[PDB]
Every structure is written in C-alpha cells, then in structure tokens.
Ligand binder design. Structure first.
Ligand SMILES: [Ca+2]
Length: 457
C-alpha cells in the first residue's frame, strides 16, 4: 500500500509541527495509529489545471502534499468536487444515462495495453504508413480517442473522438512504456495526473514546469508520493553567457548574472527579500535581491547579479510575511479551533502554539469562506476567499516549541454576515456555502525555500 512506510518517514525526517494533507482515504487507519469544506478546495487542486487550480495552500500553512495513485479510483468523486464535471457524469440519473470514468489505468508493455476489469484493450500500430491508436471495448465496439499522447516520446496521435457505433468517445489516452491511462477529456490535464503518474501535460503554457517546482518529491514508497510544498519556488535558472541566456544546471563560484524564473503558487509576493545560502564548510547567506510585488497569476522572470562563495551546494530562499505556527492546544473560551468565535463574542482566548524557529509574530483573526457557484447537469466552481478580520497582539516572541499568550479581542458582528450576503447579492441560487472558518493565525517574516542548485568547476 505505502501509507505506513510513508508515515514512518515524515516522523523522523520532517519537523515536529509540519502540517501535511492528502485526499481522504481509509489509509487513515494507520494515519491515526480532514474537513468536508476543504475537500472542495483540495479537489479544486487535484482535478483542475492552470490558474484555476492554483489554491492558496500557504493559508493552511501546508508543508507536505501526499498524493496516492490509487486515488484514481476516487477521481470521479474528486473531479465532481473540484468543479471539473457534472453530477450526471459522476453518477447520472437513475438506471442508465451517461456516467463517466474520469481515469482508467492500463497495464501493458509498449505498445499493447489492457485493463482486465473494464474489458478495455488498446492497440498501437505505430507503423508506416499507418500511425493509429485503436481501443477495443470488448463490447460495442471499437473506439477512437480524441488523441493519444506517447510518454516519453511526447508524440501526439490524433483520433476521431468517435465510436464504432458512431457514439461519442471523449477520452484522451496516455501511453507510457510500462503503463497506459484512459482519461476523460474534462480531466485530461489535471494536476493529479501530473503528480501521480508523472504525466507532464498541461493545457496552459509553462504551467507544468512551474507546478513541478512548487511540488518537489522528497519521498515515495508504494503508490504513495510525498511532495514538499513550496508556494514560491524557482523553476528555471539561466545565466548570461556570451550575450546569450543559457540554462543553468550547476552554479560555479564567482560572478553570475542569473535569470530567475519564479513560480508563485496560490498567492502573490508581497515585499520580499531574496537570499542565497552557500552550503559548504559553513552556512553563509548572501542577500541577492528583493521583490516589491509579483502577481501569482502572471509571474515574470527576475534578473539578479551575484557573487558566489565556494560551497558544496546553494539554497535560494525568499523571505516575507506568512502564517507561522500550529495549534498544539485544545485551545475559559475553549471551543472549536476552526471557528473559535461567532460574531459578537467576548472573553479571553487561551491558546498554545508550536513553532520550529524563533519568530517575532503578530496575531490576527482570519476569515476563510469556502463556497460553490453553479456554472451549469449541474457543475459547481469551488471558491476559497481569505481576509483578516482583526488584529490581537504583537509583536510576540515565539521560541522553538510551545508558547502561550493571553489573546483577547472581540469579533465584530457585521463582518462575516455582511460578507455572507455580499456573495449572495453577487451569485444566486448558484451559491452553496460549504465552510465558514474563523481562526487565529500568526504572521511573521517567514523563510520560504525556492530552489537548491549544486556546484561545480
Ligand atoms: Ca502561479
């Protein structure tokens, strides 16, 4: 399976207060040895592609994203929750009517493939003069995919999208040398496909290169892969050599003029400071530059000149304010920590917080709205809006481990009510609120890791 072995890792390898998430699974039986609203957002990440899928995971203070290949079996549920497909395509109405299989793995050495359970067979003639892909159903009858992508050859083979009986066959095929994959056209380039089966295809330009930099694999045992989440990361480094930008593989010591291709996943960059760690005989950190602001939906390359000391490795990091610390307590007020105080409620708020470094942080009360809007046979787009209600204390010195501060300031009455009706005036009817969260969070100058580059010459 892989869950127990992966959880053996992440216990000695990762930090004490390192948060992690995955899609809900029964593997939780060792994970204990979730939230129905954040499900829509997780599914929004897994089932979708490009800008739309760019979920603010840093708001959750996420450190690791664990993907699980077998979750293909649940992808119908994920797609529908992610806004990719309609109700009918998930289950349909009563006996009959089109239900869709969003993902269907194929076993086979190139180039025959087969799924023993559904009866599907796949022949790839790959010949001259006839390059074609044919999908036997073991039924009625012969189908032709929209197109078939070849991995790693990246050759795309066009098809009808039709069936032998003229019926529609809206599936994109993905053929690797050892395995195949039949995926519905609405999820053909989902992030899950990218991260689980390492199929680097996106509908949007340069997006996969970015994603793979924001989600770095640091472990992976069975059908389970552990990804280190990096909201801000460098996905390409180029150096100006002879008046020509040439892509860097390794950074030699000395003077360099680097073009840094930066990917900001889920959230923008606000007043940042760029650093480089020279990891050799000692950790000397040289500040390379700064970033005033970079929109995370339309990122752009950053040119920086830099002298590099002799070291075994280089760690480019970025520093800016962000959510630090976890709730190591329950937390007078007690009450649910994902909704600690309904509008217009006073008292105290005794909470304890676990941290891994020393932060001079401030304390806000954050509002998180997770909702749905009907865009269609019904299909719902998940939204997650985030905004600081009020500030509590600052600046408090949190040192490694647990910390306790009093914390007490009132929740205004009108805020989340007015916003809950600021959405309702905007949408229908179309609106479906799935989660209302009010939480205490600590914001401090946090060190985000962008990339690690080896040295040479
Ligand atoms: Ca982005």
């Amino acid at each position: 399976t892989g869950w127990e072995q992966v959880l053996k890792w992440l216990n000695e390898n990762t930090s004490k207060y390192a948060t992690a998430t995955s899609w809900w699974d029964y593997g939780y039986w060792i994970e204990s040895s979730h939230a129905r609203d954040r499900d829509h957002i997780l599914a929004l990440f897994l089932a979708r592609d490009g800008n739309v899928s760019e979920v603010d995971f840093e708001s959750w203070e996420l450190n690791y994203f664990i993907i699980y290949l077998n979750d293909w079996a649940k992808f119908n549920a994920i797609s529908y929750l992610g806004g990719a497909i309609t109700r009918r395509e998930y289950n349909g109405d009563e006996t009959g009517r089109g239900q869709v299989t969003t993902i269907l793995p194929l076993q086979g050495s190139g180039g025959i493939y087969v799924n023993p359970y559904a009866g599907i067979s796949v022949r790839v003639v790959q010949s001259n003069t006839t390059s074609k892909v044919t999908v036997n159903v073991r039924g009625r009858a012969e189908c032709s995919p929209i197109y078939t992508l070849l991995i790693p050859g990246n050759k795309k083979i066009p098809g009808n999208g039709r069936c032998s009986d003229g019926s529609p066959f809206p599936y994109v095929l993905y053929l690797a040398p050892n395995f195949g994959l039949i995926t519905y056209y609405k999820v053909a380039t989902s992030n899950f496909i990218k991260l689980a089966f390492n199929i680097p295809i996106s509908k949007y330009s340069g997006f996969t290169e970015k994603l793979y930099s924001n989600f770095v694999p640091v472990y992976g045992y069975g059908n389970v892969i552990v990804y280190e989440f990096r909201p801000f990361a460098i996905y390409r480094i180029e150096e100006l050599i002879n008046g020509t930008w040439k892509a860097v593989n390794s950074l030699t010591p000395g003077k360099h003029e680097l073009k840094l291709y930066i990917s900001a996943f889920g959230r923008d960059i606000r007043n940042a400071t760029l650093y480089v760690y020279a990891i050799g005989n000692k950790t000397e950190k040289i500040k390379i530059g700064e970033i005033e602001y970079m929109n995370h939906l339309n990122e752009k390359p950053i040119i920086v000149n830099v002298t590099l000391p002799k070291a075994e490795k280089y760690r480019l990091v970025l520093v800016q304010k962000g959510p630090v610390g976890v709730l190591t307590g329950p937390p007078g007020e007690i009450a649910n920590p994902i909704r600690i105080a309904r509008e217009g409620e006073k008292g105290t708020l005794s909470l304890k917080v676990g941290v891994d470094k020393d932060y001079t942080a401030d304390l806000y009360l954050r509002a998180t709205f997770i909702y749905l809007v009907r865009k269609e046979n019904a299909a719902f787009e998940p939204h997650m809006d985030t905004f600081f209600i009020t500030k509590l204390k600052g600046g408090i010195k949190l040192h490694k481990g647990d910390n306790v501060v009093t914390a007490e300031l009132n929740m205004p009455n009108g805020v989340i009510s007015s916003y809950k009706e600021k959405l309702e005036k905007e949408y229908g009817d179309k609106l479906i609120i799935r989660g209302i969260r009010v939480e205490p969070v600590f914001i401090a100058e946090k060190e985000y890791v962008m990339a690690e580059v080896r040295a040479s010459a």
